[PDB]
Write a protein that binds this ligand. Structure first.
Ligand SMILES: O=C(O)Cc1cccc([N+](=O)[O-])c1
Ligand code: NI
Ligand code: NI
Length: 257
């Protein structure tokens, strides 16, 4: 019964999941000066025109916007990836304050939040099987800074009062995740892991260099969510980020010079 506190937070997870101290854990600090430009990288293809959003769920640690992943409707290809990766969900990690919240850091800089678009490799047939493989997932990570509002985020922000507490869901159809992407698809990539239990080492991370801007008011609404279930004492859903982990024997590659 894990979480983000003093008593059950990241620094405890290893007792249940020894993989927490593994060789390819995420997130990491991205040292921009030491990431090497890789000309082998094929260009990134994000194909979200046919996406079908279904539902938004407060899972007790974040909220997930879930997609129909029963066909190739929203897919990621190219970049560092071999093959086709299907969008299953996106979620965010965020802070109690604007000065923290991202999982990845960039030269030790923390952003206010980070958006994760989670995709699984179709060669494995479903998500559950994909997470058992070293190349099972591709997560597109996008930093959020506080400034101007992000218009394409507002639909997400407005429904959050309907999923305040753990286990609540709401219909969330017709949402276009294209409206959450920055202009540039320049990226860093490295092999890593999920950042909550069970911490599986199944992720090719693709972290975009260009952040999106969201308003103060938008992020404030994320911080009104609750970790707890309805009828339990209120614990605001904030600081649901794992800190940077050791890079170990990995290289971070850049798609750009
Ligand atoms: O890495 C995370 O944010 C945690 C996590 C936990 C469980 C599933 C996830 N997913 O990527 O579908 C992600
Ligand atoms: Ni538990
Ligand atoms: Ni995540």
């Amino acid at each position: 019964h894990w979480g983000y506190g003093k008593h059950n937070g990241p620094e405890h997870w290893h007792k249940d999941f020894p993989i927490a101290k593994g060789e390819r854990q995420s997130p990491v600090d991205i040292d921009t000066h030491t990431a090497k430009y890789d000309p082998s990288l094929k260009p990134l293809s994000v194909s979200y025109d046919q996406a079908t959003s279904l539902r938004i769920l407060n899972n007790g640690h974040a909220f997930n916007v879930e997609f129909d992943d029963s066909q190739d409707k929203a897919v990621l290809k190219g970049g560092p990836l071999d093959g086709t990766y299907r969008l299953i969900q996106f979620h965010f990690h965020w802070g109690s304050l604007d000065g923290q919240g991202s999982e990845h850091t960039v030269d030790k800089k923390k952003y206010a939040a980070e958006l994760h678009l989670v995709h699984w490799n179709t060669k494995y047939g479903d998500f559950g099987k994909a997470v058992q493989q070293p190349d099972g997932l591709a997560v597109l990570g996008i930093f959020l800074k506080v400034g101007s509002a992000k218009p394409g985020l507002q639909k997400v922000v407005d429904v959050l009062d309907s999923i305040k507490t753990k286990g609540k869901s709401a219909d969330f159809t017709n949402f276009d995740p294209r409206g959450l992407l920055p202009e540039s698809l320049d990226y860093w990539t490295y092999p890593g892991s999920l950042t909550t239990p069970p911490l599986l080492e199944c992720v090719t991370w693709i972290v975009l260099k260009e952040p999106i801007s969201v308003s103060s008011e938008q992020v404030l609404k994320f911080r009104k969510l609750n970790f707890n279930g309805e009828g339990e004492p209120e614990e605001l859903m904030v600081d649901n980020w794992r800190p940077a982990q050791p890079l170990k024997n990995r290289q971070i590659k850049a798609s750009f010079k």
